Subunit: 247 residues, 7 copies
């Protein structure tokens, strides 16, 4: 039930299928709403770990003072407010997939702490003296210009080459015009069913509008606009007027 029609999206879909047999890190980039999370979850579903956990994590929103504790866990003992050991998210995802979302907003301090784990699967728990080993497939996404961040020294070169073994750059909706109408149709069908309405399609006038609008919020903005059009619709068809007052 996902839409891939434009040339680039079709290529992307192909790459996703071709890496099914692999477990190497994938770095997914693009503007807000272009479908990075959809692609990450799809890569997971088509992979050899489809039946293992998919642990999602906004890695930049974790406060700096608990970063290690949260990713690597901590050992019962001195570096403590605690009685017993606690698994971090790397262990929680052992044998599965760990999705580092907002990777490009991570602090330099935190990027450095992630460095050795990505390739070796090994780390010490906060306060522990036993190397722990996990087998985790890494996915990462960001809507930041990550190549620019590397150039400006805001993102570590050595972490970039570890994460971006496979690189999927999803283009903005406005450069995938072939996706627009099929996407709009897909949502119109979904919402019309969901809200028990009699909308069926768009006038030719409305379709022109959909194709010329920039979609700064990309697929998510499109989905929102169709969800509005359906809820406020009267006819069997959505006309240019109904859209124009929604964008």
């Amino acid at each position: 039930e996902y839409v891939f029609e434009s040339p680039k999206m079709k290529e992307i879909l192909e790459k996703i299928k071709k890496i099914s047999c692999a477990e190497c890190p994938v770095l997914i980039t693009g503007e807000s709403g272009v479908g990075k999370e959809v692609v990450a979850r799809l890569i997971h579903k088509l992979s050899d770990r489809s039946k293992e956990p998919f642990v999602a994590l906004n890695v930049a929103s974790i406060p700096r003072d608990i970063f290690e504790a949260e990713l690597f866990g901590y050992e019962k003992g001195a570096f403590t407010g605690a009685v017993s050991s606690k698994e971090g998210f790397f262990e929680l995802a052992d044998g599965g997939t760990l999705f580092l979302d907002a990777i490009g907003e991570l602090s330099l301090e935190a990027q450095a702490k992630l460095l050795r784990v990505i390739e070796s699967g090994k780390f010490y728990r906060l306060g522990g003296r036993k190397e722990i080993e996990v087998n985790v497939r890494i996915l990462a996404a960001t809507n930041r210009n990550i190549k620019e961040l590397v150039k400006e020294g805001k993102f570590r070169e050595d972490l970039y080459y570890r994460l971006g073994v496979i690189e999927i750059e999803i283009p903005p909706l406005r450069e995938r015009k072939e996706d627009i109408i099929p996407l709009a149709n897909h949502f119109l069908k979904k919402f019309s069913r969901k809200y028990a309405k009699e909308v069926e399609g768009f006038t030719k006038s409305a379709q022109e509008l959909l194709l010329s609008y920039p979609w700064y919020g990309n697929v998510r903005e499109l989905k929102n606009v169709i969800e509005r059009a359906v809820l406020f619709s009267e006819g069997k068809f959505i006309d240019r007027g109904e859209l124009s007052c929604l964008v």
Copy 2:
């Protein structure tokens, strides 16, 4: 007992009715006193959750160091040394409605923490390793210029497109002149009853004054001025003089 008379307010009232069957996030904006909270509680009352809790929260006033704990709760254990787990507000609102007030004053740090929850309904408790899932309808309001905040990078683009699926921008009272007199009348009736007074209406002169005053505090300022007029009134009618010394 709410007043909607001007064209825009009537449209707004219609949108409110048309989204009764839906559960999508609503983003309510406008100057102080224009009725954002009234609109939020109305949306609730007309919705499929009217009978479930309506949890209000000034989300920007929560101190940064307890933000997660308060929204997501915390697990008994070593991240802070409490004894037992505690529900956050998302859980407390499960099956109901969560109203994020002052959303536009939220810090960038805190906006990022809210990001994944809005669409997936999933999060980890502070210190926990079990994904929790809730089904919460989100409403948000702010008297800040939220589109400008996005342009200036003071508010995340990706959070904006998640929150503003339905957008209700309530205009200032001074651009809804058709509401002014019915509002004043509504308050005059309410307070005259409440304080056992004999006031019945306004002179034609007073009404002109009400229509030309800017109402920088909008509906709330209007309500205050009428409450004063009634308490200090003598006649059966409020004349321009009694108002002029109140504004």
Copy 3:
């Protein structure tokens, strides 16, 4: 035993009487010593809560890290604080009157925390998950130029319209010259009795002095000057010389 003689003070006294039947927030402003606390306590005495507690609070002097704890209390559990729950000042004033003094010096951070309570009477305790409801009549006073603070963004517009439902702006003594002599006389009587002296009144020369002095400390400065004059007095009358060396 309070003096209200000038036109404006007489109007103010009237407003105070006319709001006896009401419970709406009153915002009292004016220079140091003009009688803001007298007015606040008078409003209380003439109100329907005269027999309930009158909780005074310099709200701006509460340190920021305990603001919530102090106003809203805290739940047992809930952050290192403690074994058991503790009422905040809002609860302590339930059914009574809560006087927020120095309201205009409150920090922006703290103003925002007060926002929802003023109109809804509802809040959560620090660390609690049960909405608490109280019925508190709010009075507030400040010697700061609060309208200017709003214009400069130093004080929230939305809190100002919540607090200033009724607005009493008490003028400086120097613009209430009709109050000066009756005030001086009132104090002369009070202190002459208190310190067992034989002073009875002021010469005509002294009275001129009292009327032309600016009284930058207003009623309080006046009261101090008379208290001095009585303690250091010899005659049955206070002459210009005895005052001139006191101002």
Copy 4:
């Protein structure tokens, strides 16, 4: 055994006597060593509380984080640490006299915390919910230019009018030349006795020196110089030479 000979010191002594029957706050100012503490303790001795405690406190040297605890005490509970309640200095001085020394060096933050207590005698303990009432006579002293501090906003106007009900401004020794010789004589007698020496007085030459020296340390500097002259003296008289090498 205190010396008051110059006109201003004689006036001051009179004011002290005339306020014996009173309990109003006294604000004592002047350069270092002019006798502020002597005046404060004298006011106490001649007052109706001569037999009650005289609690001295360098109020500006109390660290900001314990200011409330120290002045107002704290209730058991009160954010852990303590088991039981503790009286502050206001309570310790109940029925007595509380001498706030270095009042002019107090931080703005701390001045504000003292505000309501001065006139109402009421306050809450840190963490407490019971208003406490005490009956304390306040004295305050500073060697700072307190009127300038008010003008520059470094000292609150509203606290100044509360403290300075009676104002005693003690002049520097260099503007009280009539006090110099009697003071020097008084110390000469005191130390000559104390150190078993045969000094009796000063030559006419030495006296001229004493009168022309600025005395930047005021009475204290004078006392120090005489204490030196006596210890190092040989004759029955102190000559200009013995002084000149001491100043």
Copy 5:
């Protein structure tokens, strides 16, 4: 299964062999992806400690407040949060090899704490009063310009002469063109086997491309590009086109 073909790499391999009998510190430098960790682990495998532990540590990512505790351990007692003593990483590596990675990013404060240990093998535990002695072979790597850091005072001269007894500076891939094709071939073989593909080699056109590309991520970037080429490949050979759209 490691590739050393270019002149400099062959020299480096020789040095590695010639130091097998030694235990002196080795300082390995070069751009990201040039093989510093491979060289460090190789030195270990060929050394007299091949069978002892190889403890890897990103020494610059350890937070400053726990640096000592982590390297030197801590004694049970004060400087606490603890009940019992804990070995640091120096002890954990006793008799083995300790690999200080990112040595050039270490803070000056931390560099100073490492100083005496490097040559003497002796240190006190945090809070301990017994000198501990260990026999640890030190390796260190960094992708920072470490000679420049010394010149700029960002890295201690005295630590530099302690660490760089043997200095291996690994050149970028772009200055080891003799390594490029054998490396590409090595990876092609490895991945073709791993992903069960029929790729065997590169066209002459592809090989030209590989030799002229800068390889800013060095061997790691090369390995990534080959891994892509194999996963997306169709033929038995990879042509220039398949590479060009990968670089």
Copy 6:
């Protein structure tokens, strides 16, 4: 066994003797090595407390957060490491002598805390509510220009006049040339005995050198130079050559 030969040192020695019967504060100043501690301990030995404790304290090196605790002690309660009360140094020196070394380097914050104790001998323990009284003779020294510090406001005028009742300003060695040779001789005798050497005196040439050298470290530098000369000496006499290579 102390040397006082120059005119000023002889005067100083006389002052010391003349104050034996007194207990007033002495403020001792001068460059590093001129003998401030020698003078302080001498004043003690010749005083009426020679047999009571001499408590030395580098008062400026005490960290600010424990200043009160260390000088005034703390009451059980307060709530830190504590179960029981602890004497501060003022109490430990009760009946004895308290030597405040480096007084000129004390922070303004700390100077203020010392203020009331110096003359009244009274203070409260940290956290205590009982005034404690001690009888302590105060000595103070510093190598800072204390009169300049007062002028620049870096040192309180009111503390200066309390400390400097008796003032001993010890001149640099270079302005006490009469002391140089006897001092050198005194050390030569001391060290020659101590290290079993045959040195007896200095050549005329060496003595000229000793008299013309500035002695920036004053008596201590001189003592060091003689200690070297004796240890490295061969003859019965130290010649100019042996000194010249030591200065």
Copy 7:
């Protein structure tokens, strides 16, 4: 097995012998690698304490908040000072030698804390009220320009004259050319034995190189270069070529 051949090194060796009978502080300075630690341990071995402990301490690398605790220890009680008392390093070295390394990097705050101990051997434990006395011989070393630090006020004059009773300034290798060849020979012998190689000496060409190279890392750099030359050597002799590619 230490080499002292040049004139200055021979003088230094002599001073070391001549101070065997003494216990006075020695201040050892010079560039990195010139042998300061060798000289300090030699002074110890030849001294009357050769058989007592030699406690080495990088005094500048101790964190400021534990400086006292570490040097002077702490008393049980004493701010959750743990349960029991703990000796500091001064006590641990009682009767022995305490070597303060990196003395010139010590903070002004910390230098002041060391001041009184150096000459009096007396101090209080953190939190203690019993003067402790120890008999410790002090050695100190630094590679910082300590005389310049005194002039710039970065190092206390009064501590400098306490530490530098005996001053050994070890010159750079480049100003001790007579030491170079014997040093190189000494190392060649040592390493040739250690690594079972057949190297015996240097060609005349190599020796010229050794003498003209600046040796910025001094004896340590030389030792490193010889250790490399021996490990990578083939002949019985090291020629200029083998060195030139090593420097």
